[PDB]
Design a protein around this ligand. Structure first.
Ligand SMILES: [Cl-]
Length: 410
């Protein structure tokens, strides 16, 4: 059938699934007529006819969790017609990443339901074992609306405000909380987050940057954005560079066209050094996104889904020398990927071939060189008393070891 695509009460167009299985999208005339029109994706440019490219299927598929196990749970929950994407979005497409609201064609203000601690625990635990929310991730996360100090279920098409993550890596909630705090302390653009507790559940609540309250707090708006697989028209299956996905060079080139090119290229390169320092090995293409602005211009969103592989070291069998960056750097004979083998020279060499000013690359390295020690100390003040000590020890010790390569040079 057809899923009507809305962006904050404005009709954008309709998604169709053909009898032959193909997915097509058509923009609404009224959307195309606006002087402030913007495409749903840079892979789906504004145009009048039916769009039938694989970019249509890929774009909407990328709104859903990557995991087949998670999709099975979704079908079971809402009695979805099938496992196919169009049918999943027919059930949970009301509140998605970005501003796309999908509502069945056979269907015709701000309100919410406050959750008691008991009902919150109930709602959240239900995920490990008016609620049509879809979240893009690797595990099974959901979303809720925060009103003051209470967690709530939005009614109708009222949006959510926070992405909620449960433990994966049994300490992933604590791991990400720590990494988000550290990134913020070092000047990176990342969302604020908090550890929430509902009875026996411990989850991470991350503020959404694809949502914005108006000044009077009477309307909560959704903000359009898409991830790198979506912008390049790619399936989530190629999110890693080794599978054909975009790496540093492709993304840096794309950012030359951002409405904030200078700042975004600098922030993206700074984030590569940060990931190296904290041992983040899952910085694939879906971990980066851009806001789509009026007319189709774009700029990088904050970074997110940040987790260190350091707390997983030793434990089973993973060794420090086994940790690799998802997006490799330039090396004299190819690429440099091992965190334990990377030095300032690799970042400078990468900057050189990508036309990123050497003075800017030096500034980034020198800033981490003098700020890291104090930043690791400052984060402690924001950790609860029940925060796992092994996570702090693992990350701190390894960050300091690599930081030594920066301080010696700067
Ligand atoms: Cl290497």
């Amino acid at each position: 059938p057809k899923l009507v695509t809305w962006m904050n009460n404005q009709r954008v167009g309709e998604l169709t699934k053909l009898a032959n299985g193909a997915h097509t999208f058509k923009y609404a005339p009224e959307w195309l007529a606006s002087r402030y029109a913007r495409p749903l994706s840079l892979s789906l440019p504004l145009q009048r006819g039916n769009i039938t490219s694989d970019a249509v299927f890929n774009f909407f598929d990328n709104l859903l969790p990557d995991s087949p196990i998670v999709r099975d749970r979704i079908v079971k929950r809402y009695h979805a017609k099938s496992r196919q994407p169009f049918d999943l979005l027919s059930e949970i497409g009301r509140d998605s990443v970005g501003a796309v609201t999908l509502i069945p064609e056979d269907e015709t203000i701000m309100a919410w339901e406050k959750l008691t601690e008991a009902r919150l625990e109930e709602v959240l635990t239900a995920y490990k074992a008016d609620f049509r929310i879809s979240v893009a991730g690797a595990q099974e996360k959901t979303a809720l609306l925060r009103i003051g100090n209470d967690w709530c279920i939005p009614k109708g098409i009222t949006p959510t405000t926070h992405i909620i993550k449960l433990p994966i890596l049994s300490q992933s909630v604590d791991n990400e909380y720590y990494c988000l705090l550290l990134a913020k302390e070092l000047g990176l653009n990342v969302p604020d987050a908090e550890i929430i507790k509902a009875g026996n559940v411990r989850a991470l609540a991350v503020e959404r940057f694809d949502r914005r309250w108006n000044a009077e707090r009477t309307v909560l708006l959704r903000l359009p954005q898409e991830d790198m697989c979506q912008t390049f028209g790619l399936p989530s299956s190629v999110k890693y560079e080794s599978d054909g996905g975009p790496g540093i060079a492709r993304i840096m080139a794309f950012l030359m066209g951002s409405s904030e090119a200078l700042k975004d290229r600098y922030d993206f390169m700074k984030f590569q050094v940060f990931q190296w320092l904290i041992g983040a090995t899952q910085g694939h293409a879906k971990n980066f996104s851009v806001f789509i602005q009026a007319g189709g211009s774009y700029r990088l969103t904050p970074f997110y889904d940040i987790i260190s592989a350091f707390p997983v070291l030793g434990g089973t069998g993973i060794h420090i020398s086994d940790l690799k960056l998802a997006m490799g750097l330039n090396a004299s004979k190819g690429k440099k990927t091992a965190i334990d083998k990377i030095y300032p020279r690799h970042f400078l060499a990468t900057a050189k071939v990508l036309r990123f000013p050497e003075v800017q690359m030096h500034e980034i390295l020198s800033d981490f060189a003098r700020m890291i020690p104090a930043a690791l100390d400052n984060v402690k003040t924001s950790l609860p008393t029940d925060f796992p000590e092994n996570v702090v020890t693992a990350v701190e010790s390894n960050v300091l070891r690599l930081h030594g390569r920066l301080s010696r040079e700067y």
